[PDB]
Amino acid sequence: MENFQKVEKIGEGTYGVVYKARNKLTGEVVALKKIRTEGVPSTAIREISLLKELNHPNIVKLLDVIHTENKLYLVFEFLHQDLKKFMDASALTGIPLPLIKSYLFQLLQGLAFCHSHRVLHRDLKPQNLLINTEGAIKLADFGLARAFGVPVRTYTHEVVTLWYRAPEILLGCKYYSTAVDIWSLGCIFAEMVTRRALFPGDSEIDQLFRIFRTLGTPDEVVWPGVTSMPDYKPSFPKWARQDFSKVVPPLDEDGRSLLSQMLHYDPNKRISAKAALAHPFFQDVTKPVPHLRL
Numbered sequence: 505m506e507n508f509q510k511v512e513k514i515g516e517g518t519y520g521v522v523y524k525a526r527n528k529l530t531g532e533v534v535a536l537k538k539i540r541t542e543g544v545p546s547t548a549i550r551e552i553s554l555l556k557e558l559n560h561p562n563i564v565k566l567l568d569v570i571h572t573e574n575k576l577y578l579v580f581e582f583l584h585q586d587l588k589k590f591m592d593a594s595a596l597t598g599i600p601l602p603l604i605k606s607y608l609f610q611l612l613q614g615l616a617f618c619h620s621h622r623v624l625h626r627d628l629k630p631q632n633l634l635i636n637t638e639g640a641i642k643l644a645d646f647g648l649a650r651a652f653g654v655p656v657r658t659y660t661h662e663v664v665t666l667w668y669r670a671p672e673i674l675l676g677c678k679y680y681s682t683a684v685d686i687w688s689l690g691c692i693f694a695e696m697v698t699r700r701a702l703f704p705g706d707s708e709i710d711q712l713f714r715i716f717r718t719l720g721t722p723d724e725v726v727w728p729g730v731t732s733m734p735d736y737k738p739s740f741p742k743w744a745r746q747d748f749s750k751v752v753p754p755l756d757e758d759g760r761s762l763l764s765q766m767l768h769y770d771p772n773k774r775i776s777a778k779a780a781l782a783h784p785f786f787q788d789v790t791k792p793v794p795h796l797r798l
């Protein structure tokens with residue numbers, strides 16, 4: 505980009521490529537995302553022009569949006585590491601509980617904010633959660649499946665991760681609710697605690713069945729209306745819910761209680777971000793500094 509010196513490619517996002525770049529003029533270092541073509545929708549640039557005002561300490565700041573040459577560029581504040589990398593870097597020892605708790609609390613603050621402003625993330629995963637040396641964690645790469653759409657990959661040959669997808673999306677719900685973000689965050693919470701993905705499906709049905717095998721195949725009792733969902737099949741196997749203490753050992757009962765509420769099948773029973781913030785698990789929340797190697 506004529507106005508930026510791509511320092512390096514920092515990823516192949518779900519819409520385009522992401523580069524670390526320096527503003528040749530201001531000297532500020534940013535994350536530049538080049539969006540995918542033949543005119544670009546306007547309803548999108550509005551949805552985007554909306555996210556620019558969605559400013560919060562736990563939401564990656566969207567600095568500028570630029571539509572030019574069938575290319576759409578999003579300029580974001582740069583963060584040095586994502587949670588996926590940090591989790592991999594902490595796999596032998598694990599992220600200390602106080603830090604896991606701080607991160608979970610901050611992400612819920614970010615989601616409570618998004619949700620109170622009627623914005624859904626829709627694609628939370630460790631790779632889209634950015635952290636800095638001061639102990640903050642922020643939501644990045646908001647989905648925008650209602651502003652541009654959800655492509656088969658990202659833009660070119662790239663398998664989309666289904667591990668954090670809410671069951672209602674997998675069952676074909678046409679309208680997502682804020683609850684899909686709580687589900688994804690609960691999956692991330694579990695993963696930070698156990699150091700292993702909770703539901704690592706490699707296909708939509710395998711993702712769905714891995715969820716069913718752990719939480720039990722949903723029925724009308726725990727999820728009213730489930731058997732009437734678009735992709736629900738009466739032929740789905742009937743798995744019994746496994747004991748919850750076996751899922752995230754050795755997480756304490758306060759943590760397990762909160763997680764169970766973030767993982768309720770029925771989107772309406774699923775705890776809201778606002779309510780989760782008041783959960784007993786956060787009585788002793790603090791803000792530790794992570795050990796980051798950059």
Ligand SMILES: C=CCNc1nc(N)c(C(=O)c2cccnc2)s1
Nearest residue numbers: 517535580581582583585586644645
């Ligand atoms: C994690 C280190 C790179 N630094 C980044 N810093 C930011 N701000 C990044 C993003 O806003 C982002 C992330 C994933 C997909 N699309 C955009 S990436």
